[model samples]
Target: QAMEGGPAAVHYQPASPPRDACVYSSCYSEENVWKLCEYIKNHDQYPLEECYAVFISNERKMIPIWKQQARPGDGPVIWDYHVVLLHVSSGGQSFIYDLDTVLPFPCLFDTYVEDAIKSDDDIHPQFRRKFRVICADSYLKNFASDRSHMKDSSGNWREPPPPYPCIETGDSKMNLNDFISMDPKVGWGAVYTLSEFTHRFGS
Candidate 1:
């Protein structure tokens, strides 16, 4: 395996971005994603085009995810929606950056699929996840959220908004719900079924 001329000698090595370098906040996945795109945009190691904004949700807004702080156990958290970025290297290696996941900072795409996003087998029909794969540049330009969704009817914060300014596109005030919606026609990028998502990026 150590031989210089062997196939195993050269393989995919995922980038390890230091944890502190990534901006994060509790329950602010969308903002975390924005900051992550900005991070890559400024960094020379990976071009912005290699990054894709991946939004995971279902029609019911219930997806079971493991290794999350919300649960802190073997059990999964039934999140309404979740956001993460996919980094595809020039050599066809893909990785997922999930600030909310306790898994590796830039988890291998295959490992993320297997562990963080468990299979849908035997799960209730409503819980099956759908994915929206949007280009990072497009996401950065178009995504905006006022954090209104996090507010309770009592006009109190259900989850504290990020300290930084809210994301806003030039023409829109808030469009976070559209990204969270799994309906293929509602979002900016093409939506994909789980299998299609894996097929396209799970190299």
Candidate 2:
């Protein structure tokens, strides 16, 4: 609830910041990413499928790409592997959210990828949208990984109170990468595609 007159009203508006967003609230990417998407699904009235979690890899099985800031000088920078939420709007438009970056929450996936591979060292970096993404729904449902590692001592990470007009006292005090390494041994087995996961779980 990083909003005015809301619980945890802190300014973490990194990506396409929305007034006041939580930046360093918690470094639990996996825990936060899917939760945010799930919130978007119900809060924004989007179908669960429309707003879901996506795990991408820049260096084979290494995804995502967390960007704290976007600048002209950051063009040639290399981002760390990461995961985020993807929102595919009804108009067939897509946006990604990596809570820690300035890519704008719901940033266009294409633009996000373009910025990722931008490098002065070569004609292009190896990461040309070269990432494998899997939905958190399937993984969580099939694998039974409920992110217990991120048990909220202070229900700060839970869904914001209610909506626009609410107060927030939820907050967390922890490091992002301290608990889970970049390639944290999470999920069950390997991340699977939507179809693959469906076959396994039989949606």
Candidate 3:
């Protein structure tokens, strides 16, 4: 530790992969998160463990979020579910990367909480948010998806699947539902209430 009453000298720039390098598709936040993991894995500067895959949804599947490209006129979108990546810096600062959001590409956790995620208070109980936090390493290793959820009744795509192949792990091939499920007892990652999640990661 440096001098007790002196200005702190520690300084470092927050780092993230360039936006051009990130893979994204319409209405496919999970794929974006997956691509981010792959990018971070190859980039030696960012420790993969400090990153987390966060799935935001409630049992009703109608969580409201602001600053989304999917909505217009300053209104919130009632997305069935959404995924974003949380990166914790070495200094303990947390940043969130939501590819589909109109907000900053990698916004500070506090700003994201205020402008994007907003609060659960006074909102309908059925629409409150829940988070399933999974470590990036575990997520990269265990996550898989078959893109079945994006299909219509006729087996046509609701939105086209990503150009890249579906994500798959050796042991699992189609467990995207597991991550999106907010039910506390049935998921791969630890589930937390909105308050609990912000308390754990917010500065």
Candidate 4:
């Protein structure tokens, strides 16, 4: 149920007899535009007039559609053609034109394993192996966020004093653990571990 066409094969008429109908390379031509129009007119269940047809080169770009809304840096270079369906009653909502032919990639096994290691402790024997496999597929690189500090000619983080740890208490008798334990609720080992993991993962 997928339609294929070249650039010229597709024609869009903002104004014409049918108004918003789009003609594609495979089945859209002067002689057959009406035929496609007829299909749209007949399929009232789809609200075709509000829909747009888009063409993308592959399935990776289609991921956002399946998930609803594009992720960062996905606005451009994600696809070449996309048909959007517009709804007027709801103040003109748009939907992906074709859902039947869109495809999804198989989950990368090594990447999945590495990702699972974030929660599974028993997999330690092959943990590094999984990490290597995951990293080998460029997963780490792709997921890494840019952390270059902002500078103002002086080459430092733009903000003043970006918060660093320092010994806070003056009494030597109140050691680090003792000082921390003073706040029993906050000093629990579980809380510390959770906070430590979150900071490390930037989550």
In terms of lDDT, the best-performing candidate is 3
Q: Please identify which of the two predictions, 1 or 4, would achieve the higher lDDT against the true structure.
A: 1
Off by over 4 Å in 1: 1-17
TM-score each candidate.
0.90, 0.48, 0.91, 0.18
Tens-digit lDDT track for model 4 on 1-203? Answer: 86521231123222112323443322111112222323555554433344221111121222112221233232221222222211212232211122221211111212222331133243233211110001111211122211122245767654333222221223331222311121334311221232232232221
Q: Candidate 1 lDDT, tens digit per residue, 181-201?
A: 888868698899888988898
Q: What is the lDDT of candidate 3?
A: 0.85
User: In TM-score terms, which candidate is top?
Assistant: 3
Regions more than 4 Å wrong, model 3: 1-15
lDDT: worst 10-residue window of model 1: 3-12
**What range of 10 consecutive residues in model 4 has the weakest lDDT sum?**
128-137
Ranking by lDDT: 3, 1, 2, 4
TM-score of 4: 0.18
Q: Clash pairs of candidate 1? A: none
Q: How high is the CA lDDT of each candidate model?
A: 0.82, 0.43, 0.85, 0.24
Candidate 3 residue-wise lDDT, 1-203, digit = tens: 76422011134343456665677898999888888888888878788998999999988899999998878558899999999999887767788988878887788788899888888898899999999999999999899998988998899999978997888888988998889898777867799998999999887
lDDT of 2 by residue, 1-203 (tens): 56312111122222223524533243445555645644544453455555555554433333324355433344333334455666555555556676666665655555655564232234343542232344544433432223333346864544322222211112322223322232435432244432342233221
Q: What order do candidates take by TM-score, descending?
A: 3, 1, 2, 4
